[PDB]
Design a protein around this ligand. Structure first.
Ligand SMILES: Cc1cc2nc3c(=O)[nH]c(=O)nc-3n(C[C@H](O)[C@H](O)[C@H](O)COP(=O)(O)O)c2cc1C
Ligand SMILES: CCn1cc(C2CC2)c2c([C@H](N)c3ccc(C(F)(F)F)nc3)n(C)nc2c1=O
Ligand SMILES: O=c1cc(C(O)O)[nH]c(=O)[nH]1
Length: 376
């Protein structure tokens, strides 16, 4: 019972019908900047705790990349009831993006189409913000167990992807719990060509290597170097696009097994949806419910491509507790939300968290970890 939630749900219906999508995004981020967003301070179910190696998540719901592309709103977003957040995608130097008429919504289909183009303030400034949060985190008990991941990418005009990725790792590595490599954005020309097994292999090795390089050349203990939640080196995940052929998707898996990737996010937006009349002749990748079923199979695909050896992070059309369980049973260990917060709002995390707890009770599972890969 926290009345501070519904006050915002009143205005939600207004926004979906009148306010431009990005104007709603900036407004939301502004609210959390001033710490006036609702609070979910109830303990989470110990049966819902999940992990990926030494990453321990209090609950299995964070917000996906592109939500807080610059980490100026981490404190409040997390306090809504999310265990972690993925900030970014970030690039070395700031970028403005594309034609500001970028993101559009369709309420009925619960879908979104976006053509942002990695609009961010740059690696240096976003690093300043994350540092401020980590300091606030040490003096706040509502942030003591929460995790922050950083999605990294390349500028549109970069000549080589590896160079940009490394500059980020070397500037913001110490403050990240994990690092997700975004080589799947459909709104930045090219990039997806890096999904080729050869270049993807070199990419993964370079990133994993670059993170390993931060320890050696220090004068202090490993305890003080990592100013993060784990106090350990950041793990390396990779985000993949759904628009691949089955042959490339087994090539991809081969790279992840060969390179010992710590995780595989599944998945980003798609460019194959063409049955939304309000989205006809509009550029960008589609998000929301229409991406649900497509991504789910991609989990089963990659969970069987990779021989169950790489944990999977679920992202795509997740709105309800049963949606999350679908992702879990397919092979995912954790879930990310975005469109759910666009259409369901600030009450999303609490809503979806109560629904998942209740479903695990009826399905007979003792805890969440028991459900990964069970309807295969
Ligand atoms: C406006 C917008 C911006 C996004 N920006 C990023 C991004 O910068 N990096 C990334 O990896 N994914 C980005 N995404 C994709 C989301 O992180 C997520 O994968 C996708 O929206 C599916 O989630 P959903 O179906 O729950 O909405 C973005 C999506 C939208 C709608
Ligand atoms: C696709 C961009 N993006 C993002 C959001 C997410 C940022 C939180 C959108 C929302 C959101 N559910 C919301 C609720 C309440 C308010 C307000 F103003 F009441 F505080 N603002 C935004 N909405 C309605 N549209 C979004 C969007 O387009
Ligand atoms: O990975 C990404 C990136 C973008 C963007 O910045 O435009 N948009 C998406 O839908 N996915």
């Amino acid at each position: 019972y926290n009345p501070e939630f519904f006050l915002y749900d009143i205005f939600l219906k207004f926004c979906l019908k009148y306010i431009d999508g990005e104007i709603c995004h900036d407004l939301f981020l502004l609210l959390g900047k001033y710490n006036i967003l609702p609070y979910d301070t109830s303990n989470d179910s110990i049966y819902a705790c999940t992990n990926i190696k030494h990453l321990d998540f209090i609950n299995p719901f964070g917000v996906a990349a592109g939500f807080d592309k610059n980490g100026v709103c981490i404190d409040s977003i997390l306090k809504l009831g999310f265990s972690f957040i993925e900030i970014g995608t970030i690039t070395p130097r700031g970028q403005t993006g594309n034609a500001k008429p970028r993101i559009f919504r369709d309420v009925e289909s619960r879908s979104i189409i976006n053509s942002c183009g990695f609009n961010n303030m740059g690696c240096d400034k976003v690093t300043e913000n994350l540092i401020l949060f980590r300091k606030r985190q040490e003096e706040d008990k509502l942030l003591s167990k929460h995790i922050v991941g950083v999605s990294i990418g390349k500028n549109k005009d970069t000549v080589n992807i590896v160079d940009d990725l490394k500059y980020c790792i070397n500037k913001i590595g110490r403050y990240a719990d994990y690092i997700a490599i975004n080589v799947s954005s459909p709104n930045t020309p090219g990039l997806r060509d890096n999904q080729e097994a050869g270049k993807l292999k070199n990419i993964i090795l370079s990133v994993k290597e670059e993170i390993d390089n931060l320890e050696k050349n220090n004068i202090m203990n490993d305890e003080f170097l990592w100013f993060n939640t784990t106090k350990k080196k950041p793990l390396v995940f990779v985000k993949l696009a759904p628009d691949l052929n089955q042959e490339q998707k087994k090539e991809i898996a081969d790279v992840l097994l060969e390179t010992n990737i710590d995780g595989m996010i599944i998945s980003n937006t798609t460019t194959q949806i063409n049955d939304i009349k309000s989205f006809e002749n509009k550029k960008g990748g589609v998000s929301g419910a229409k991406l649900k079923d497509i991504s789910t199979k991609f989990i089963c695909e990659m969970y069987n491509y990779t021989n169950k050896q790489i944990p999977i992070i679920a992202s795509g059309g997740i709105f309800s507790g049963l949606d999350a369980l679908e992702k879990i049973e397919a092979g995912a260990s954790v879930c990310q939300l975005y469109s759910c917060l666009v259409f369901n709002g600030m009450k999303s995390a609490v809503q979806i968290k109560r629904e998942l707890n209740h479903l695990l009770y009826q399905r007979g599972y003792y805890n969440l970890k028991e459900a990964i890969g069970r309807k295969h």
